[PDB]
Enzyme design. Structure first.
Site, PDB file in Angstrom:
ATOM      1  N   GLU F  62      -5.069  20.923  56.919  1.00  0.00           N
ATOM      2  CA  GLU F  62      -4.928  20.007  58.029  1.00  0.00           C
ATOM      3  C   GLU F  62      -4.052  18.832  57.623  1.00  0.00           C
ATOM      4  OE1 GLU F  62      -8.670  18.455  59.287  1.00  0.00           O
ATOM      5  OE2 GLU F  62      -8.748  16.903  57.735  1.00  0.00           O
ATOM      6  N   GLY F 135     -14.070  24.198  54.066  1.00  0.00           N
ATOM      7  CA  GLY F 135     -12.981  25.056  54.481  1.00  0.00           C
ATOM      8  C   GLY F 135     -11.870  25.122  53.463  1.00  0.00           C
ATOM      9  N   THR F 136     -10.834  24.299  53.664  1.00  0.00           N
ATOM     10  CA  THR F 136      -9.620  24.323  52.852  1.00  0.00           C
ATOM     11  C   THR F 136      -9.898  24.221  51.356  1.00  0.00           C
ATOM     12  OG1 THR F 136      -9.203  21.941  52.775  1.00  0.00           O
ATOM     13  CG2 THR F 136      -8.688  23.064  54.791  1.00  0.00           C
ATOM     14  N   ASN F 197     -22.971  15.411  45.505  1.00  0.00           N
ATOM     15  CA  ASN F 197     -22.890  14.092  46.117  1.00  0.00           C
ATOM     16  C   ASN F 197     -24.136  13.253  45.863  1.00  0.00           C
ATOM     17  OD1 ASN F 197     -21.261  16.084  48.284  1.00  0.00           O
ATOM     18  ND2 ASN F 197     -20.201  14.216  47.631  1.00  0.00           N
ATOM     19  N   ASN F 219     -15.814   8.431  43.994  1.00  0.00           N
ATOM     20  CA  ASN F 219     -14.626   8.982  43.357  1.00  0.00           C
ATOM     21  C   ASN F 219     -14.141   8.104  42.215  1.00  0.00           C
ATOM     22  OD1 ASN F 219     -14.920  10.892  45.330  1.00  0.00           O
ATOM     23  ND2 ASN F 219     -13.135  10.261  46.528  1.00  0.00           N
ATOM     24  N   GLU F 245      -9.778  23.040  22.386  1.00  0.00           N
ATOM     25  CA  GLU F 245     -11.088  23.160  21.762  1.00  0.00           C
ATOM     26  C   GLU F 245     -12.226  22.664  22.641  1.00  0.00           C
ATOM     27  OE1 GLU F 245      -8.491  21.670  19.788  1.00  0.00           O
ATOM     28  OE2 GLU F 245      -9.171  19.694  19.124  1.00  0.00           O
TER      29      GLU F 245
END
Ligand SMILES: Nc1nc2c(ncn2[C@@H]2O[C@H](COP(=O)(O)OP(=O)(O)OP(=O)(O)O)[C@@H](O)[C@H]2O)c(=O)[nH]1
Ligand SMILES: Nc1nc2c(ncn2[C@@H]2O[C@H](COP(=O)(O)OP(=O)(O)OP(=O)(O)O)[C@@H](O)[C@H]2O)c(=O)[nH]1
Ligand SMILES: Nc1nc2c(ncn2[C@@H]2O[C@H](COP(=O)(O)OP(=O)(O)O)[C@@H](O)[C@H]2O)c(=O)[nH]1
Ligand SMILES: Nc1nc2c(ncn2[C@@H]2O[C@H](COP(=O)(O)OP(=O)(O)O)[C@@H](O)[C@H]2O)c(=O)[nH]1
Ligand SMILES: [Mg+2]
Ligand SMILES: [Mg+2]
Lengths: 45, 426, 428, 161, 426, 428
Positions: F62, F135-136, F197, F219, F245
């Protein structure tokens, strides 16, 4: 990002120096002799 | 040559040891930087008895200062003459020996005895031959009666051929400092009687009575007691370091003053002692110094010697003096009050003269005796022990670190038949 | 090095901590922020550039006293999340502090004291301050010492309780709270000194002439007592003692570990001027049978052990001779089997006075921690205060309808009665 | 550069202090309105916070300068007698210049100064040497958390150097 | 006349030879540029054993810096005393091993092994006649334990008479840094045991307690370990550089230390190690250096010699001294330890006085001994190997880069075959 | 030199990358116009006159999350050709992203990935930041990763997933497409660091004292996590850990490669100055059960391997002391095939702080990433969730519509059923 003067949190300057097996000790009159030190010395004031 | 390893242990042990090096260094001209300010050969001709040279003109002492708690190491090192020892010999624990014999001898002293034994064999195997060890522990408390006596068993079996002198400080039940003194005393006699050959009993009641009645000091402190003890400490080993007419090492004291191999607890008293005023009225001569050392208000044990008898005795005379007056005065005391001097030994005592007097003095005496009045010491602590053990008082700590009910009954037995072995020679 | 975590639980425990973490701050030189203008190692972990924080947790199931410290002067002396609070308290009920509200506060408190004990392995012991006369102090304090035994066990757990007084109780359900919390007070603490409130009222009624004292004065005298037991735990001194040296030299049998406390001189400016402080004088006023700080006549009992903490300009022979004069008095008796019953400890640091407080600048002070058979009396008042209410089940529907069942009240009765028969069989 | 000229910055009991009397301290402006319920609710918390910070320490750590968003001089003095910290007189255009610089206005916006984002009333905002914003205390913002966002202060890392 | 070719392998090797090429270069008076700046003509005599002279008067070390990560030699070339090396022998990879033994000894080390063997033989073929090679490989990791040990295999066949002395860093389990250190270590051993001459084993754990319990420092860096090993790197090669009163090179250490042809792994110490506090108080003469040499704490392996017998040794004393206090203390400790000494050899001690000490130091010594008590440090790693390999854990990336499963069970088959071999001489 | 091409798909991956590329700009100081007013060659490619351009390919079917970052403050930093956008959203649907709407964008995404993977020498890994919650993110994420498997076979392919958290679920079809995406996460991914979350919800309230954070604050935490992970590649320090490693010390078997994460000094500056963040304190805060950013109690399942990314001013010896502290603790359990169970890395520059964020300055942080058997019940809780909707086949007509032969649900059922079945097979 101009704020670079943000001082470090927690005062962590880790000890680069050697350890101290000896901590400060106040010299005590109770364990200091005096008295009999001059009485076993024949001072004759 | 002959070196004396000094094995200070406990709060009382390290404090009397620090003053001991405070009264040996000033005799040997040692500054607390390792240097020597002096002008006599006599101070370094036998400096190896107590000091070891370490490659920089510094005479670091042979002292193995130990305890289980990190406090009194700091007081000694920061104290006077403190920056003289080796910090590797400042071997200490980090927990607290809270007047508990069980965790000084069995559990907590067990993980420190291996490190202390490494330090003592460090400075004892590297020599020509050691004359003997010298412990100054206290026979009341946790690490003095604990860690102090635990090594006594370990280094006896490591060197079972050498003199092992112990300036033990017996507890005073008249007025004391702790409550578990009887447990910390009876559990330390029975291994100080089998793994030691020269005990020197010191009470604090004597250290307080004779500083106040003889020296006439209103309030002399703990270090004043330390200097009184250390004065006797220097006078027993005077002949090893400094030369004299009739020299006497530690083994000479043992051979003349031990009637039977179990009877080796010794009275000791240093006997020039005048007050602030009477320093100019008293006459310093051999008869006056002789009368003092038999006088009971000079004694550093507070067990009165005339309630019992005298098996044997000795007096390390120290100073320039004529040697007839050393020995003619000693039948004046042996023939006047012969009710004390026992009859199965003629001329009960050993005399000796080391020519160099202690600092400031001109003549000093260090009277050591084996009188059967120390059975009163083992009598009054027996009163304290049988009152508590009969009711299992203060026991859950001691049975807590694994040591159990049974060895109290041979702790009482080893002290009781020691009293009985002093009853049947008086 | 050596350190103690001072758990402060309840509402009275926080109010004691308000006084102790003002006297300790003045004693070490810590600002209300934390900076100074190495004795500060038993109390203040150095978390900053001179910025210290106390090794304490403030714990109360009610938020109002916890937030009041959070908005007070020492809002940055303390780490903000060390002050743990809840919403509903316990209201005057053992089983609310112990069961229902106590689920959600013990998990974060014991997590926090774990993060206060990991700063050094050389921890001497834990302190716990409570009032066993009400909800959170007895209720959560019981469950706290339950789980403290299944974590670090050989580590010592001391206790400074705020036991109910004879006529002072300021609660109606308090004999149910005090008796039913003796189980944690007998099997999970090592030193369990009692301190009821109106003894301390009497201290500041006869020796301070305060006819109108508040709770803040009582906490100040308590803070001076805590300062004098742990004075050796941070400073130098002629005779040094730690917390394990208290227990080994004051606790004869494992169940007999409830102590009594005194402190002297409790004197002010108009008194201190006309009186010479000598060591015999302070230890005489400490041994008098009214200076005891929880309402227990030592004449109606026999001493078993006695710890004295000389502190300041004190020489040891003034200790060693005046302790003989105590032993010669016939009004005081050591029972049969402790004829060395005296552990004297000497410090050099004088007791610091809080300015504008109520004490003087005395150079020498003694605190008493003594064991006696006289404290059968302090537990026997709870015998007719509990059993007479319990005869027909008074104030019981709160406790039984809220998790705990009937029968645990019976168990507390022979827990106190086995404690009562224990003190009478020891002293004969 | 200079933020507050010689005659602009006056504290309580009406003594003017220059810019020289402000280094070493964590400095915030406080844009507030006398009749505003947010300001009336926030002010006791600000007073207690300021008292605890600036009383319990060895240095005067933080410092607040008031800017009025009120109607008149009597409303100024009635608000002003309640705060002990610094302030700027309303009739000084320095208040309006700060209003336009730090974007703290009160919905009179298109009539004079028709830009965008608003950051309304009240706003205590910490500043620095050249008048730059340092960090926003989120009373009425994207965090919208009132009466406790004063604790989001950073006095050690924001100083008027 | 004698020459040593030094190759540094892995991030440990290129940082422990980074400090080795600091400590041996100021011992010969070398500027960071490469000029000679010293105080003695007794520095420029055996520069040939570690250096090649270039044009203009600039000595360049015989050092092949070998790794697969490019970042390590970037820090060495930027740090001090790193620009001294010739840039063409900075043989750097770019892919880098993932701490895998397959990553280097079978894949992505084998293409680059022609790049390192060409530059090794360029230094090696230009010589009078070289002694051999020294390699600082780093068991536990991926490059030192990997392609560095393939250098050990693929130099042995071209120089089968030249010595293959090699310093090793084994992974201790409490100072573990990588979970597959068990797999890397025990795969590097079973190839080193048949192609080597002298494996000086070093542990990071015992590097920590020598600096925490003897050098008296708490957490002040990691480079303190590099300098302590670097003294031992140059202490063994005292005669190949400087004249000695009695002489011993590494071929001397071969005959007098290896009794049987699978007895290679040796224990390394270095013992004028003095703390800050005990600097003034310690005697730095010969008897105090022979006791710390045999102190089990000073050994740079957590493989306590008191828990094993003791086949051979070599005492590399380094300082002007009398040889008649070297050797009575060899027989003194041999008589006074007795049981911790092999019985089918009359004298278990070697001695070689080297005449010139390291700067600062008046006198030093480096232990190189062959004791059975390296059996427990080997068997400790073998306990780790039997943990994962019993269910084949972490194994799909040692079999995806070549290897079968058979070389893992062969790595242990000759592992326990050797530790039993060390065990039955006890 | 080294580089790691980042590939973000889904609005969660784009917004995460808006914080990760935010923070990489300020670590090595690089302005939004590319210019700086050899360490930048790990996430940037210098081209021209100081024009540093990131190594990223944005992906969403989108045009809403990536058109918005075109008009934001990074129009010039993010060069406008790798911000790949489509028109129709995949609409929370695996059969849309992995099928009909999405082959048009895989072709162009593979073109720009191939341009970014063959313009710098020795590419080192692919950091994918996907979102298995819709979705995406899941559909185009599965199709794209299946093409990288054959285009680059020897290649390390770290992922960073937002798995559906237990109670929080913002779309009802999350249980379907989470199970449907395990086929893309079990045999086509080397490192599978797990995020969700509601665990980063809890990590910000009790530690950073924000009771209403946002996905920006989430984030920022994820950006701190990957900054510590890639700090050893970018920067210098003792005992470096490479991506080569990283999985060698965490992946015992080729199928079990699902790891977790915890940060450590996540403290706002108020209660950050009041605690001394020691090495032992931060590593036990890292191994704290509440500090995992996944609903995973790490006490119902034994650990297998740990990867403790220390960074800042940390000495390499007290790390071993604090690791030994964790090993002796019985609350942090291990399994019997690992006497050693730690691989630790150390950087030298401090963990950075974003000006205007919720964190403070610390020069230490433990981003430990661990592969434990306790990740299994995260997947097995989704097993019971998936079966309850599949029983009577709701939300299925869309999947069957644009693809999804009925039986892909059954093979994804048994793929994830064989997944946790391996986990208790391993640890016994
Ligand atoms: N010494 C002292 N005792 C107090 C103080 N405040 C309350 N008490 C006593 O505490 C007992 C009642 O319990 P509280 O401490 O008030 O409260 P609690 O038992 O902790 O239960 P909550 O009120 O729910 O927190 C009463 O006996 C009070 O006399 C105080 O400030 N100092
Ligand atoms: N951590 C984090 N998670 C997010 C963020 N935005 C969305 N998510 C999560 O992403 C999951 C669904 O993926 P979305 O990003 O919403 O949608 P998508 O993956 O792009 O695919 P579409 O459904 O076609 O839009 C949800 O469970 C959200 O919790 C974010 O900004 N940060
Ligand atoms: N004579 C003397 N006695 C001391 C000294 N220090 C402590 N004591 C005595 O030791 C007894 C207490 O024992 P303590 O020192 O605690 O035993 P520890 O466990 O070895 O430390 C008390 O009776 C003190 O009088 C000192 O310097 N001199
Ligand atoms: N003594 C010492 N040990 C090190 C040094 N650097 C790393 N080590 C340790 O040596 C071990 C061997 O690893 P190594 O093979 O060199 O790592 P690699 O090069 O990445 O394969 C590592 O586990 C490190 O902990 C160093 O400079 N000195
Ligand atoms: Mg109450
Ligand atoms: Mg979105």
């Amino acid at each position: 990002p101009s704020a670079g003067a943000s001082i470090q949190a927690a005062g962590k300057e880790i000890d680069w120096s050697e350890k101290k097996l000896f901590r400060k000790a106040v010299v005590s009159t109770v364990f200091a002799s005096d008295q009999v030190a001059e009485r076993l010395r024949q001072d004759l004031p | 040559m002959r070196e004396i390893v000094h094995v200070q242990g406990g709060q009382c042990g390290n404090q009397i040891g620090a003053k001991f090096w405070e009264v040996i260094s000033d005799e040997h001209g040692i500054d607390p930087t390792g240097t020597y300010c002096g002008d006599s050969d006599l101070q370094l001709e036998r400096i190896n008895v107590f000091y070891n040279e370490a490659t920089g003109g510094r005479f670091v002492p042979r002292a193995i200062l130990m305890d289980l708690e990190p406090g009194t190491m700091d007081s000694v090192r920061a104290g006077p003459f403190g920056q003289l020892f080796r910090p590797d010999n400042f071997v200490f624990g980090q927990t607290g020996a809270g007047n508990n014999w069980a965790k000084g001898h069995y559990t907590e002293g067990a993980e420190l005895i291996d490190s202390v034994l490494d330090v003592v064999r460090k400075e004892a195997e590297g020599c020509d031959c050691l004359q003997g060890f010298q412990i100054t522990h206290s026979l009341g408390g946790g690490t003095g009666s604990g860690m102090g006596t635990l090594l006594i068993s370990k280094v006896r079996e490591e060197y079972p051929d050498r003199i092992m002198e112990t300036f033990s400080v017996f507890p005073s039940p008249k007025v004391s400092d702790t409550v578990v003194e009887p447990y910390n005393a009876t559990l330390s006699v029975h291994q100080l009687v089998e793994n030691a050959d020269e005990v020197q009993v010191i009470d604090n009641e004597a250290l307080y009575d004779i500083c106040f009645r003889t020296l006439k000091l209103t309030t002399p402190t703990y270090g004043d007691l330390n200097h009184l003890v250390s004065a006797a400490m220097s006078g027993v080993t005077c002949c090893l370091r400094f030369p004299g007419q009739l020299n006497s090492d530690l083994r000479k004291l043992a051979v003349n003053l031990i009637p039977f191999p179990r009877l080796h607890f010794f009275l000791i008293g240093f006997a020039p002692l005048t007050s602030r005023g009477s320093q100019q009225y008293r006459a310093l001569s051999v008869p006056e110094l002789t009368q003092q050392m038999f006088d009971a208000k000079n004694m550093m044990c507070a067990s009165d010697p005339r309630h019992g008898r005298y098996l044997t005795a000795s007096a390390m005379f120290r100073g320039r003096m004529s040697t007839k007056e050393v020995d003619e005065q000693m039948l004046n005391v042996q023939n006047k009050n012969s009710s004390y001097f026992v009859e199965w030994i003629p001329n009960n005592m050993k005399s000796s003269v080391c020519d160099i007097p202690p600092k400031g003095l001109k003549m000093s005496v260090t009277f050591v005796g084996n009188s059967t009045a120390i059975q009163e010491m083992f009598k009054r602590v027996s009163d304290q022990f049988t009152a508590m053990f009969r009711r299992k008082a203060f026991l859950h700590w001691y049975t807590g670190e694994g040591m159990d009910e049974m060895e109290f009954t041979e702790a009482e037995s080893n002290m009781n038949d020691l009293v009985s072995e002093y009853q049947q020679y008086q | 090095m050596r350190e103690v975590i001072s758990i402060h639980v309840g509402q009275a425990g926080i109010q004691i901590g308000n006084a102790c973490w003002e006297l300790f701050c003045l004693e070490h030189g810590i600002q209300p922020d934390g900076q100074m203008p190495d004795a500060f190692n038993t109390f203040f972990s150095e978390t900053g550039a001179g910025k210290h924080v106390p090794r304490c947790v403030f714990l109360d199931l009610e938020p109002t006293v916890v937030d009041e410290v959070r908005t007070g002067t020492y809002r940055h002396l303390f780490h903000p999340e060390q002050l743990i609070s809840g919403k509903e308290d316990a209201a005057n009920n053992f089983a609310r502090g112990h069961y229902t509200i106590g689920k959600e506060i013990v998990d974060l408190s014991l997590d926090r004291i774990r993060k206060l004990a990991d700063n050094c392995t050389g921890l001497q012991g834990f302190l716990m301050f409570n009032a066993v006369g009400g909800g959170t102090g007895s209720g959560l304090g019981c469950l706290l010492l339950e789980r403290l035994s299944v974590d670090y066990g050989k580590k010592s757990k001391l206790n400074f309780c705020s036991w109910p007084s004879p006529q002072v109780s300021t609660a109606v359900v308090e004999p149910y709270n005090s008796v039913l919390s003796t189980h944690s007070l007998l099997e999970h603490t090592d030193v369990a000194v009692m301190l009821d409130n109106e003894a301390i009222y009497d201290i500041c009624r006869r020796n301070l002439d305060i006819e109108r004292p508040t709770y803040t004065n009582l906490n100040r005298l308590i803070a001076q007592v805590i300062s004098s037991l742990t004075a050796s735990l941070r400073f130098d001194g002629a005779l040094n003692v730690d917390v394990t040296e208290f227990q080994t030299n004051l606790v004869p049998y494992p169940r007999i570990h409830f102590m009594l406390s005194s402190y002297a001189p409790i004197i002010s400016a108009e008194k201190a001027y006309h009186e010479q402080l000598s060591v015999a004088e302070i230890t005489n006023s400490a041994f008098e049978p009214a200076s005891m700080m929880a309402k227990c006549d030592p004449r109606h009992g026999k001493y078993m052990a006695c710890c004295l903490m000389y502190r300041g300009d004190v020489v040891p022979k003034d200790v060693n001779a005046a302790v003989a004069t105590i032993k010669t008095k016939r009004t005081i008796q050591f029972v049969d089997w402790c004829p060395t019953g005296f552990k004297c400890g000497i410090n050099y640091q004088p007791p610091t006075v809080v300015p504008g407080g109520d004490l003087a600048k005395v150079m020498r002070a003694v605190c008493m921690i003594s064991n006696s058979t006289a404290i059968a009396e302090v537990f026997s008042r709870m015998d007719h205060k509990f059993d007479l209410m319990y005869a027909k089940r008074a104030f019981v529907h709160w406790y039984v309808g809220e998790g705990m069942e009937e029968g645990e009240f019976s168990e507390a009765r022979e827990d106190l009665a086995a404690l009562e028969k224990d003190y009478e069989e020891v002293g004969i | 550069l200079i933020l507050f000229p010689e005659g602009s910055l006056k504290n309580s009991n009406n003594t003017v202090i220059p810019q020289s009397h402000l280094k070493g301290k964590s400095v915030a402006l406080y844009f507030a309105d006398g009749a505003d319920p947010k300001c009336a609710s926030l002010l006791p918390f600000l007073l207690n916070y300021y008292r605890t910070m600036n009383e319990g320490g060895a240095n005067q750590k933080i410092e607040i300068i008031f800017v009025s968003l009120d109607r008149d001089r009597e409303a100024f003095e009635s608000h002003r007698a309640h705060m002990p910290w610094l302030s700027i007189d309303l009739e000084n255009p320095l208040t309006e210049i700060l209003k336009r610089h730090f974007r703290v206005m009160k919905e009179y916006e298109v009539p004079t100064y028709g830009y965008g984002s608003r950051t309304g009333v009240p706003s205590v905002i910490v500043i620095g040497s050249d008048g730059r914003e340092a960090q926003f205390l989120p009373i009425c913002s994207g965090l919208e958390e009132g009466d406790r966002a004063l604790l989001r202060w950073d006095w050690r890392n924001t100083k008027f150097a």
